[PDB]
Amino acid sequence: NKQFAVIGLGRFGGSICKELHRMGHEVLAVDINEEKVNAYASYATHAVIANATEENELLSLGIRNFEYVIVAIGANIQASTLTTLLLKELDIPNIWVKAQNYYHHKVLEKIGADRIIHPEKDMGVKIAQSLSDENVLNYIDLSDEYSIVELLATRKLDSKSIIDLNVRAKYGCTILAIKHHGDICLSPAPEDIIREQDCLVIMGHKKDIKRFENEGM
Amino acid sequence: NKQFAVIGLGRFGGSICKELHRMGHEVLAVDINEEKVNAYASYATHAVIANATEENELLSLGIRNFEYVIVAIGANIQASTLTTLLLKELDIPNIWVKAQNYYHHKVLEKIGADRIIHPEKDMGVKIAQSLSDENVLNYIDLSDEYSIVELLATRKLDSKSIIDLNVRAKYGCTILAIKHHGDICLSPAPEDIIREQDCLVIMGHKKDIKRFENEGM
Amino acid sequence: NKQFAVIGLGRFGGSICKELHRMGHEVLAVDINEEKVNAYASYATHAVIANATEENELLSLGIRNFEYVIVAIGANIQASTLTTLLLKELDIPNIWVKAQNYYHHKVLEKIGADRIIHPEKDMGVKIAQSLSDENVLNYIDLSDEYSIVELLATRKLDSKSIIDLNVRAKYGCTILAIKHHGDICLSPAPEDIIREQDCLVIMGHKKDIKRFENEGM
Amino acid sequence: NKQFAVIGLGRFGGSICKELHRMGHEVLAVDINEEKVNAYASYATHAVIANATEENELLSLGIRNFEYVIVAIGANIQASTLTTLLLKELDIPNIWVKAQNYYHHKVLEKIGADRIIHPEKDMGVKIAQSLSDENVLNYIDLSDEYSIVELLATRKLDSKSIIDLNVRAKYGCTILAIKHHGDICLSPAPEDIIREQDCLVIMGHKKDIKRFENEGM
Amino acid sequence: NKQFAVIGLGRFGGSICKELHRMGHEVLAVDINEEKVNAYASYATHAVIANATEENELLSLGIRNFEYVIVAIGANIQASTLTTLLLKELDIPNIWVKAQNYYHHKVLEKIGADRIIHPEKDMGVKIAQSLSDENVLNYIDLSDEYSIVELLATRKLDSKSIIDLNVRAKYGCTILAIKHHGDICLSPAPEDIIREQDCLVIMGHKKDIKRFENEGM
Amino acid sequence: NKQFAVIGLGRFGGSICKELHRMGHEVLAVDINEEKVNAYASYATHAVIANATEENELLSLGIRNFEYVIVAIGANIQASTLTTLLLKELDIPNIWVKAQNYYHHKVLEKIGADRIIHPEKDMGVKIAQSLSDENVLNYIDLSDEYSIVELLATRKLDSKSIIDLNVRAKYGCTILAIKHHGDICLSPAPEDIIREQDCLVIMGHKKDIKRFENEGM
Amino acid sequence: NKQFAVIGLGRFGGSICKELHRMGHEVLAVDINEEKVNAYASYATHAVIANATEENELLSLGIRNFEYVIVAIGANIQASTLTTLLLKELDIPNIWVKAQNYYHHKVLEKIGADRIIHPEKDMGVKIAQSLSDENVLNYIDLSDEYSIVELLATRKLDSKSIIDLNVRAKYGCTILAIKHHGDICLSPAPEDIIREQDCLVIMGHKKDIKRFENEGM
Amino acid sequence: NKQFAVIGLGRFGGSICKELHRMGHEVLAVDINEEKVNAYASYATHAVIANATEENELLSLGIRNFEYVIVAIGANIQASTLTTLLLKELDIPNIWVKAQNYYHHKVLEKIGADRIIHPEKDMGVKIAQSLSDENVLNYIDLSDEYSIVELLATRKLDSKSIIDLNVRAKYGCTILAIKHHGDICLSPAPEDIIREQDCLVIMGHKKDIKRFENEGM
Ligand SMILES: Nc1ncnc2c1ncn2[C@@H]1O[C@H](COP(=O)(O)OP(=O)(O)OP(=O)(O)O)[C@@H](O)[C@H]1O
Ligand SMILES: Nc1ncnc2c1ncn2[C@@H]1O[C@H](COP(=O)(O)OP(=O)(O)OP(=O)(O)O)[C@@H](O)[C@H]1O
Ligand SMILES: Nc1ncnc2c1ncn2[C@@H]1O[C@H](COP(=O)(O)OP(=O)(O)OP(=O)(O)O)[C@@H](O)[C@H]1O
Ligand SMILES: Nc1ncnc2c1ncn2[C@@H]1O[C@H](COP(=O)(O)OP(=O)(O)OP(=O)(O)O)[C@@H](O)[C@H]1O
Ligand SMILES: Nc1ncnc2c1ncn2[C@@H]1O[C@H](COP(=O)(O)OP(=O)(O)OP(=O)(O)O)[C@@H](O)[C@H]1O
Ligand SMILES: Nc1ncnc2c1ncn2[C@@H]1O[C@H](COP(=O)(O)OP(=O)(O)OP(=O)(O)O)[C@@H](O)[C@H]1O
Ligand SMILES: Nc1ncnc2c1ncn2[C@@H]1O[C@H](COP(=O)(O)OP(=O)(O)OP(=O)(O)O)[C@@H](O)[C@H]1O
Ligand SMILES: Nc1ncnc2c1ncn2[C@@H]1O[C@H](COP(=O)(O)OP(=O)(O)OP(=O)(O)O)[C@@H](O)[C@H]1O
Ligand SMILES: [Tl+]
Ligand SMILES: [Tl+]
Ligand SMILES: [Tl+]
Ligand SMILES: [Tl+]
């Protein structure tokens, strides 16, 4: 009976609701706009036109029965703050709120939001990382110094090997997976071959990976 | 270094500009809102007020001299499409546009945009995956079936060494890194232990990682 | 069962719909404005209030059954582009779209519009031709050099003949029809007479016709 | 040369101004929108920002010195009517106004406009005639019953000479010109042949031309 | 069966309708505003919410049955012109239209309005006449030189007579009525007495009356 | 001469200002609309742009120096009331305000306005009286029962002398003046005749004048 | 059957209505906004959506039966003036109106409002008094010179007495009540003790109390 | 003296500023409306136009140098909250904010506002208490049960001495002061008399004061 409410159907909120309902979960789409409700109705377990700033409508949805509530309102700062304050004063266990600027994050922190999300800023940082380094496809920072990076193998790495491309001693990183033509190899053996336009999953220090990219690739 | 031009300062494009200049690149912050230009003036090389949909203002910016142009406008579909068409007529090597819906992405496809980004949608998918599983902190999908996952250790995981939790054979997964008290052990040994409320990096097929989440932690 | 849909009731679109329904054809008038629908209802086979940007309403009209669809929306550029993209992605054979500027024409070209029309620009060119040359009433350009021109015969041509006004040798043109008091003569004999304020249909090079106008008329 | 004044730069009036100056005439581009004046400044002799409905601004323009004044305003009915009345009070020899509906045309009639144009309506009639008959490319109506038509040749017409297709006696029409590969044969001979996807100019009564379209091609 | 229609309920139009219905006449109040119709309903024989610019609604009121129609719309110039043109083209015998400026009067003249009224301008002239001459209460100009004037008798005229105040020879005017305490005397005898604050009805040349006011009063 | 200040240039107040300056008085044209100030600048002594509801701007105008202040604002009830209150606080001898409805007149009464004018209402009463009786041209009501009336002569009145139409005894009225072909006979003799389409001035009780209109003409 | 009407639900008006209905009185909440009526419905004896500027709706509420009527409209000056004038002309005994500025107070005075209230100005004065004097909690001015003041006893007054803190002779004031930990003592005996952070109710001249605060506290 | 900064000039904050400067303090009048800054410029030391929600403008004002900051904005909830958060981040010792509703007060609580004021609510409570009891003029509540009350004397109270009205024993209350004809007797004697229409200060429990109001007056 785990329940998720998504207040504020937008790109972020609509994506959250659609992805949660695709997973086989109970989601209630809530938006003050009738058209947004009609849009995301077929992608949720329930869809109600409600003004989340209103305590009466909030109670009428059965908001108390939801373990998780996600306020994806990000453009209207005062509406998002009102919804978050109402949800806290109604004792919702987990409130995840989308922020707009740093002060919105501060005021959502002070009123007790469980998690505050900055989607656009994070994706902008990631896309900038992919912009300066045209090799990287995706990545994940384990810490401020260590990261796992997926990379497009260049012509310089075409038909090379795991011992021919030695990184555990020449650059300090290790190689974790290789994707060729759609088939993936995990924990690759020292004999495995990397080809041009393959996907390489390296892991180590940021500067180590960049050393490998400048010198190796 | 590299010639970047971020048209459309916003939460996404502004983050791109800020991070790319912290990276030390020539980033031209283009906006029509004077307050937007002033907000990111301290973070860019040149911050010019201009309407990108105007050909005269675009030639005034010298936008043909830039190798990378990023149209982060995603709310004004017409303005974004017009700017992308103007840049494609100007033979820009790389055009990266932010899209709003499927049809905006389609019209950006037809007019020759090089890379179309949907930040809010993908980040909402990620946050929904974190909502359905409170254990996962971050992840990267190698393919539609294989992934690397960051997890938060639980009471069922405290003082459990890597040899007690055989993931190499019980689930076909591999533990990649442990993070304890801000320090990090990369490629940990079978005798290394894990304490609760730590960051655990595992690699393998999605259902196998979920199997470990269910049975082990 | 040939079917024409006219989306965007306006001067151009309303004229297209009224002229097609006068011809004894099946036309569906579609406009987002209830008043425009009520206006052009009595001049069409069917009239429905629909938002053409909406895929659901577009499917509800039975848009798939129309062989020809005419998007006469010209002022709202983004709405016209959305309607055209939807009609293409719904596999409409012939899409005829009214344009507003040269970039609207380009974006309608890139998304696959079958025909793009610039009514106002064309009629402005024609009216300018009638403005500088007060003699011409209507015309048609066969090529960039040859044209057929209807002209008001001046007093200088009153009670003149086809051999008295020789143009097949004196100016290189030929005379094709003469309209006197409402009666018309085609392929006129060499003995036919032109009178003042008659309609003369000459045909030949533009400069040849202008020679005849300066010298003959 | 000739004194023209295009009040109301738009798709229609702007085309008039552009073409008339490519023709090399003194064309005064009058508009109230500064951006409209700047858009057509490179194509006119003088492009002044002015409100035509104001008598003081109209005397400032020296509009009484112009033989031809064209009020292309068709969306603001009141402004167009007021401008036409102001010009008629100023004894302008030729006033040509763009109209929107039947009643705007009637009030332009009553206040003494010399020529009223309905561009979109007539062009929509033409495009509707081209929609009902895909063969016709352009046409000019000599009278309500007689016309000259440009047609696109079909497979039924390839390698057919002018004597095989007797239009002079079988249908009472006459072929006027053939256009093949951008070259053009004017007043073609009976032994001249026509290939498919060519431009064919025929002349005659409307029903007779349609008879040839049905039976021949 | 004499019938009056009042289109445009306002101060002027509402006053016309209320005064006509007080007289025991058939009046139809017509206004596009539901509140104005509800207001002037109880003061008319009928009240209908109608958009007079619409020919269909105009016909639905039975506008053809009205001998007199008064378009009191004065602020919306284009709406008043449209209503007047419609009423003329529907062959209304008498059309009385309220004007706003001199050009509105001209355009209503050209489209065939039977009477054009300038209420505010006329009353402003009258109030200015009462302003400069504090003696005058009301008046009526018989011609540009002769007028009948009602005046407040001053202390200088208190307890004076018709032969004591001789005006048929001393100033060229005659005295026509005297109102004392509410009782009025017409064609007053030479023995009648004027008292302070009485109402005097003099008649003659403007300069003659002003002579009498400067010298006599 | 006299110190007048017309606050609120409009159709009423603008007429007051224009006529009063044609009369040669010091008329201060006060308005908040710059175009309104410019429109009546050529007709006044001083035309200042000012907001009358502001005490500082009112003391800047030197409005305490004026003996007569006319607030012609009748659409903005609040602004007119505030201006009247500001002038009454400034001890203006004569304040004449234009009113919109009964309640605006009441609040102008309570705050001490000297004279309240309802131009449109009274002029609509006059025009309604002219509509019910096409014979009357103008009139002045001496009392609720007695009046002077200007009439248009009919066929029943042509070549009728003043002794044939005994109004002195048959109806208790008196003919005051005749107007023929722009010339005027004042206080006409019993042998003076009247032709049709002339201006006839009669004086007497309302019902008696109507009796003559019915029986004589 | 004493009855209170509250027109203008706002902070001030809503507080008046809620406090009057808490007291066990008959209150009718009246607001032109449906949401305000729904809000203050559960806190009143009746709640009706009405436009108080309308005489018909005002009569429909039964406004004649209310002995007290409170116009809490303060932002819309003209609406408040209209409501007050209507209530006076309907002979309401007691009209209490909320004012906005000094001129609104003047115009409400002139139209006969029984009481005019300036809540925000009064509370601003009180809060300024508490701002400069951080000791005072609340007070009440008996006259422009004498006042009763509640004060927070400082550390300088901790464990002091009524004869140890002598004010009837040392500063001219008297002590009236002492509040310790929630228990209050009225007309305190000469032996009573004041403690730190207690509430002291002194009474006397303003300068006397300030002497005591500077010297004693 | 003391450093005050009133952000948000309004009826409340403007009164605070005016009174505090009449008190002779350094009061910085901060507003975004230029007319608001000009309105209170004559009553403050410095009156700067600034947007308080902007960090740059706030550091430009030198707001960190002020010991007391009063955000009187109560209609714009977002702007007030943002300003309060900006000041709390700047370590202002005393922040006093004006609130609109319970939730605005709650968010001001969470972000660390020192004192939150609800002027209209409390003043409406006071005016409601004065409406239910016409005798009370002002009052101060010592506790939820004890209060000091100012009353207006009635006919039942004229010529009644303090010993005839034993409030010390009949009701447990005490008369504190009498006010007659603008003069005031403080701490009056048992033989002092009271006349009607005087100001009487009584002290005691609420129900006891009401008992005296019922039985005595
Ligand atoms: N009080 C409210 N109650 C319910 N829904 C609301 C309320 N206020 C706004 N919304 C809706 O929540 C959604 C949030 O979208 P909004 O445009 O405000 O933010 P955004 O940051 O641009 O969104 P995103 O990037 O997630 O698409 C909108 O669909 C909006 O209509
Ligand atoms: N010519 C232009 N046309 C449109 N937007 C422009 C233009 N020049 C600059 N911009 C900026 O582009 C930005 C992108 O628009 P907007 O912020 O409405 O869209 P969004 O994609 O929803 O934003 P975000 O990604 O920040 O959430 C705006 O901040 C706008 O000021
Ligand atoms: N999404 C839509 N769906 C349906 N009809 C639409 C839509 N958007 C606009 N329309 C209608 O289509 C018509 C197009 O007129 P519009 O004023 O936009 O263009 P225009 O270039 O001025 O027209 P024209 O010259 O043909 O009269 C209008 O009646 C408009 O209301
Ligand atoms: N005084 C004026 N009054 C009205 N329009 C004016 C005036 N001066 C210039 N104009 C221009 O006249 C043009 C005609 O108006 P508009 O474009 O709305 O009408 P339209 O006939 O539908 O246009 P188009 O023929 O270009 O489709 C506008 O672009 C406007 O800027
Ligand atoms: N098309 C229309 N059909 C019917 N009524 C209309 C139409 N357009 C306007 N009206 C109404 O006619 C009335 C004319 O008032 P308007 O304010 O336009 O003129 P005005 O000169 O200020 O009036 P007045 O001085 O007579 O009060 C208004 O009540 C308006 O709502
Ligand atoms: N401070 C002011 N407040 C209001 N109106 C002002 C002010 N200063 C000047 N005016 C002018 O007063 C005029 C009177 O207002 P408006 O024309 O709307 O009313 P009206 O009585 O219906 O007009 P009219 O009598 O001309 O028909 C306006 O033209 C306005 O520009
Ligand atoms: N004509 C009317 N009839 C009834 N209610 C009205 C009318 N006009 C305004 N109101 C309502 O009266 C209330 C007065 O609030 P308003 O915002 O106008 O004043 P305010 O001074 O800001 O109020 P406050 O400080 O008391 O909250 C509002 O709820 C408004 O909707
Ligand atoms: N940055 C700012 N944000 C918001 N308001 C500001 C700002 N700077 C100045 N102000 C002023 O703060 C004032 C408070 O807002 P407003 O008057 O709408 O609220 P209110 O609490 O209902 O008012 P009042 O207490 O006077 O009745 C406004 O007059 C506004 O001009
Ligand atoms: Tl966004
Ligand atoms: Tl057009
Ligand atoms: Tl008016
Ligand atoms: Tl307030």
Residues of A in contact with H77 (CB under 8 A): 78
Helix (H, G, I), strand (E, B) or coil at D34: helix
Transcribe chain G into DSSP letters: --EEEEES-SHHHHHHHHHHHHTT-EEEEEESSHHHHHHHHTTSSEEEE--TT-HHHHHHTTGGG-SEEEE---S-HHHHHHHHHHHHHTT-SEEEEE-SSHHHHHHHHHTT-SEEE-HHHHHHHHHHHHHH-TTEEEEEESSSSEEEEEEE--GGGTTEETTTS--TTTTS-EEEEEEETTEEEES--TT-EE-TT-EEEEEEEHHHHHHHHHHT-
Minimal-distance CA residue to ligand 6 atom 14: F73
For residue C27, how far is the Cα from the chain centroid? 19
Q: Is B51 in the pocket of ligand 2 (CB under 6 A)?
A: yes
> Subunits that touch chain E (at least 3 Cβ pairs < 8 angstroms)?
D, F
Helix (H, G, I), strand (E, B) or coil at B139: strand
What are the tokens at B73?
């406008």
Transcribe E20-49 into DSSP letters: HHHTT-EEEEEESSHHHHHHHHTTSSEEEE
H32 assigned ligand-binding residue = yes
Transcribe D110-126 into DSSP letters: HTT-SEEE-HHHHHHHH
Going by C-alpha positions, the residue among A123, A122, A172, A177 that lies closest to residue A151 is A177
Tokens 């003799």 belong to which residue? Answer: F189
CB contact under 8 A, B131 and A186: no
Ligand 8 centroid, distance to H117 Cα (angstroms): 14
Query: Which ranges in C148-205 belong to alpha helices (H)?
Result: none
Closest chain F residue by Cα to residue G83 = F103
F120 assigned ligand-binding residue = yes
Question: Is D142:C180 a contact under the CB 8 Å cutoff?
Answer: no
G73 assigned ligand-binding residue = yes
Helix (H, G, I), strand (E, B) or coil at C88: helix
Going by C-alpha positions, the residue among B145, B133, B138 that lies closest to residue B217 is B133
Q: CA of A61 to nearest chain B CA: how many angstroms apart?
A: 21
Q: Looking at domain B1-118, what is its CATH homologous superfamily?
A: NAD(P)-binding Rossmann-like Domain (3.40.50.720)
**Ligand 8 mutation target, pool G104, G120, G122, G127, most atoms within 8 A of CB:** G120
Residue B90 buriedness (CB in 10 A; 0-12 / 13-18 / 19+):
middle
- Which part of chain H has CATH 3.40.50.720? 1-118
Question: Is A70:B131 a contact under the CB 8 Å cutoff?
Answer: yes
Helix (H, G, I), strand (E, B) or coil at E186: strand
Largest CA distance in chain H: 68
What is the strand order of the sheet E136-141 is part of? E136-141, E146-152, E199-205, E174-180, E183-186
Give the determination technique.
X-ray
What are the tokens at F33?
């609309």
What are the tokens at E212?
């009498």
Nearest to G11 among H121, H177, H179 (CB): H121
Ligand 12 centroid, distance to G34 Cα (angstroms): 20
Going by C-alpha positions, the residue among G117, G105, G118, G108 that lies closest to residue G87 is G108
Minimal-distance CA residue to ligand 6 atom 13: F8
Q: CA of A33 to nearest chain H CA: how many angstroms apart?
A: 22
Going by C-alpha positions, the residue among H104, A76, A112, A100 that lies closest to residue H83 is H104
C100 assigned ligand-binding residue = yes
Question: Is E128:F23 a contact under the CB 8 Å cutoff?
Answer: yes
Q: What spatial distance separates the first Cα and last Cα of chain G, rounded to whole Å?
A: 51
| Cα–Cα distance list, E148 to E142, E155, E194, F130, F173 (Å) | 7, 22, 18, 19, 16
Helix (H, G, I), strand (E, B) or coil at F46: strand
Classify the C-alpha dihedral E71-E76-E80-E83 as positive or negative.
negative
Residues of D in contact with C124 (CB under 8 A): 11-16, 18-19, 72, 119
In a mutational test of the F interface, the residue from E131, E173, E205 whose CB has the highest number of chain F CBs within 10 Å is E131
Cα–Cα distance measured from residue A55 to residue E49, given in angstroms and rounded to the nearest whole number: 40
Partners of B28 in beta bridges: B5, B46
Ligand 8 centroid, distance to H10 Cα (angstroms): 6
Residue D42 buriedness (CB in 10 A; 0-12 / 13-18 / 19+):
exposed
CB contact under 8 A, B103 and C86: yes
Strand duo D3-7 + C199-205: pairing: unpaired
Q: What is the DSSP letter of A93?
A: S
Cα–Cα distance measured from residue C10 to residue C13, given in angstroms and rounded to the nearest whole number: 5
Residue G86 buriedness (CB in 10 A; 0-12 / 13-18 / 19+):
buried
Q: Is B10 in the pocket of ligand 2 (CB under 6 A)?
A: yes
Tokens 């790495």 belong to which residue? Answer: A157
Nearest to G174 among H18, H140, H187 (CB): H187
Classify the C-alpha dihedral D168-D170-D173-D178 as positive or negative.
negative
> Subunits that touch chain G (at least 3 Cβ pairs < 8 angstroms)?
F, H
CB contact under 8 A, B131 and A16: yes
Nearest to H128 among G19, G118, G145 (CB): G19
- Which part of chain D has CATH 3.30.70.1450? 133-217
Q: Looking at domain F133-217, what is its CATH homologous superfamily?
A: Regulator of K+ conductance, C-terminal domain (3.30.70.1450)
Residue B5 buriedness (CB in 10 A; 0-12 / 13-18 / 19+):
buried
For residue H67, how far is the Cα from the chain centroid? 21
What are the tokens at E8?
């445009």
Cα–Cα distance measured from residue G202 to residue B179, given in angstroms and rounded to the nearest whole number: 66
Going by C-alpha positions, the residue among E56, E23, E24, E27 that lies closest to residue E41 is E27
Q: What spatial distance separates the first Cα and last Cα of chain B, rounded to whole Å?
A: 48
In a mutational test of the G interface, the residue from F88, F100, F111 whose CB has the highest number of chain G CBs within 10 Å is F111
> Considering every ligand atom, which ligand is closest to the CA of B72?
2
Transcribe H188-206 into DSSP letters: --TT-EE-SS-EEEEEEEH
Question: Is G182:G137 a contact under the CB 8 Å cutoff?
Answer: no
What are the tokens at D191?
């032994």
Cα–Cα distance measured from residue H96 to residue H114, given in angstroms and rounded to the nearest whole number: 6
Q: Residue D187 belongs to what H/E stretch?
A: none
Tokens 């004002």 belong to which residue? Answer: H61
Angle subtended by helix axes C77-89 and B77-89, to nearest 10? 80
Cα–Cα distance measured from residue F49 to residue F61, given in angstroms and rounded to the nearest whole number: 9
Q: Residue F141 belongs to what H/E stretch?
A: strand F136-141
Q: CA of E79 to nearest chain D CA: how many angstroms apart?
A: 9
Q: Of all atoms in ligand 5, which is nearest to the CA of residue E33?
A: 31
SS3 content of chain H, % helix, strand, coil (to 5): 40, 30, 35
Question: Is A69:A92 a contact under the CB 8 Å cutoff?
Answer: yes
Cα–Cα distance measured from residue B68 to residue B66, given in angstroms and rounded to the nearest whole number: 6
Question: Is B155:B196 a contact under the CB 8 Å cutoff?
Answer: yes
Ligand 4 centroid, distance to D47 Cα (angstroms): 15
Minimal-distance CA residue to ligand 3 atom 22: C75
Question: Is G17:G9 a contact under the CB 8 Å cutoff?
Answer: yes
CB-CB neighbours of D213 under 10 Å: 18
Question: Is H54:H29 a contact under the CB 8 Å cutoff?
Answer: no
Query: Which ranges in chain F belong to alpha helices (H)?
Result: 11-22, 34-39, 55-60, 77-89, 102-110, 119-132, 167-170, 206-215
CB contact under 8 A, G12 and H120: yes
Closest chain B residue by Cα to residue A186 = B204
Cα–Cα distance measured from residue H216 to residue H156, given in angstroms and rounded to the nearest whole number: 7
CA dihedral E29, E35, E40, E46 (to 10 degrees): 40
CB-CB neighbours of D15 under 10 Å: 25
A155 assigned ligand-binding residue = no
CB contact under 8 A, A86 and H103: yes
What are the tokens at A21?
């309902």
Strand duo C94-98 + C68-71: pairing: parallel
What are the tokens at D69?
């004044």
Residues A6-38 as b/e (b if ≥16 CB within 10 A, e otherwise) read bbbbbbbbbbbbbbbbeeebbbbbbbbeeebbe
Strand duo F199-205 + G46-49: pairing: unpaired
**Ligand 4 mutation target, pool D15, D32, D77, D116, most atoms within 8 A of CB:** D32
Question: Is D135:D152 a contact under the CB 8 Å cutoff?
Answer: yes
Minimal-distance CA residue to ligand 6 atom 22: F75
CB-CB neighbours of C3 under 10 Å: 16
Question: Is E9:E36 a contact under the CB 8 Å cutoff?
Answer: yes
What region does D16 belong to: left with phi over 0, alpha with psi -120 to 50, or beta? alpha
Cα–Cα distance measured from residue B138 to residue B151, given in angstroms and rounded to the nearest whole number: 7
Partners of E48 in beta bridges: E30
Question: Is G159:G192 a contact under the CB 8 Å cutoff?
Answer: no
Closest chain G residue by Cα to residue F54 = G103
Q: Is A153 in the pocket of ligand 1 (CB under 6 A)?
A: no
Classify the C-alpha dihedral F128-F133-F137-F141 as positive or negative.
negative
Cα–Cα distance measured from residue H40 to residue A115, given in angstroms and rounded to the nearest whole number: 44
What are the tokens at D135?
């063969």
Going by C-alpha positions, the residue among F175, F189, F188, F148 that lies closest to residue E177 is F148
F75 assigned ligand-binding residue = yes
Query: Which ranges in chain C belong to alpha helices (H)?
Result: 11-22, 34-41, 55-60, 77-89, 102-110, 119-132, 206-215
Tokens 């505050």 belong to which residue? Answer: A116
Angle subtended by helix axes E11-22 and F119-132, to nearest 10? 40
Going by C-alpha positions, the residue among H78, H213, H65 that lies closest to residue H153 is H213
| Cα–Cα distance list, D48 to C7, D27, E95, H109 (Å) | 37, 11, 40, 60
Question: Is E99:E117 a contact under the CB 8 Å cutoff?
Answer: yes
Q: Residue E52 belongs to what H/E stretch?
A: none
Residues with CB under 6 A from ligand 6: E 120; F 8-12, 31-33, 36, 51-53, 72-76, 79, 98
Residue E50 buriedness (CB in 10 A; 0-12 / 13-18 / 19+):
buried
Angle subtended by helix axes G77-89 and G102-110, to nearest 10? 20
CB contact under 8 A, F186 and E140: no
Q: CA of D107 to nearest chain E CA: how many angstroms apart?
A: 7
* Resolution of the PDB structure in angstroms: 3.1
Question: Is A8:A33 a contact under the CB 8 Å cutoff?
Answer: no
Question: Is E66:E1 a contact under the CB 8 Å cutoff?
Answer: no
Nearest to D132 among C25, C123, C182 (CB): C25
Question: Is C150:C200 a contact under the CB 8 Å cutoff?
Answer: yes
Based on DSSP, count helices (H) and strands (E) in chain D, helices before strands: 8, 13
What region does C39 belong to: left with phi over 0, alpha with psi -120 to 50, or beta? alpha
> Considering every ligand atom, which ligand is closest to the CA of D11?
4
CB-CB neighbours of D60 under 10 Å: 11
What are the tokens at E179?
């109102």
Transcribe B168-214 into DSSP letters: HHHTS-EEEEEEETTEEEES--TT-EE-SS-EEEEEEEHHHHHHHHH
In a mutational test of the B interface, the residue from C56, C82, C88, C105 whose CB has the highest number of chain B CBs within 10 Å is C82
CB-CB neighbours of G56 under 10 Å: 10
Cα–Cα distance measured from residue B69 to residue E23, given in angstroms and rounded to the nearest whole number: 77
Going by C-alpha positions, the residue among F72, F118, F123, F122 that lies closest to residue E117 is F123
CB-CB neighbours of A103 under 10 Å: 17
Tokens 């007053």 belong to which residue? Answer: E188
Cα–Cα distance measured from residue A84 to residue A101, given in angstroms and rounded to the nearest whole number: 16
A77 assigned ligand-binding residue = no
Helix (H, G, I), strand (E, B) or coil at E137: strand
What are the tokens at G58?
């005002």
Which residues are CB-contacts of H106 (< 8 A; sequence separation ≥ 6)? Answer: A85, A89, A111
Backbone torsions φ then ψ of E173, nearest 5 degrees: -95, 175
Cα–Cα distance measured from residue C144 to residue B141, given in angstroms and rounded to the nearest whole number: 60
Transcribe H123-140 into DSSP letters: HHHHHHHHHH-TTEEEEE
Nearest to E148 among F2, F127, F140 (CB): F140
Q: What is the DSSP letter of D178?
A: E
What are the tokens at E165?
């105040």
Q: CA of A57 to nearest chain B CA: how many angstroms apart?
A: 25
Cα–Cα distance measured from residue B185 to residue H72, given in angstroms and rounded to the nearest whole number: 54
CB-CB neighbours of G189 under 10 Å: 9
For residue F217, how far is the Cα from the chain centroid? 29
Ligand 10 centroid, distance to C120 Cα (angstroms): 6
Cα–Cα distance measured from residue D46 to residue D24, given in angstroms and rounded to the nearest whole number: 13
Helix (H, G, I), strand (E, B) or coil at A84: helix
Cα–Cα distance measured from residue G131 to residue H16, given in angstroms and rounded to the nearest whole number: 9
Residues G146-173 as b/e (b if ≥16 CB within 10 A, e otherwise) read bbbbbbebbeebeebebeebebeeebeb
Residue H137 buriedness (CB in 10 A; 0-12 / 13-18 / 19+):
middle
Q: What spatial distance separates the first Cα and last Cα of chain F, rounded to whole Å?
A: 48
Q: Residue C194 belongs to what H/E stretch?
A: strand C193-194
Question: Is G176:H176 a contact under the CB 8 Å cutoff?
Answer: yes
For residue G70, how far is the Cα from the chain centroid? 14
> Considering every ligand atom, which ligand is closest to the CA of F84?
6
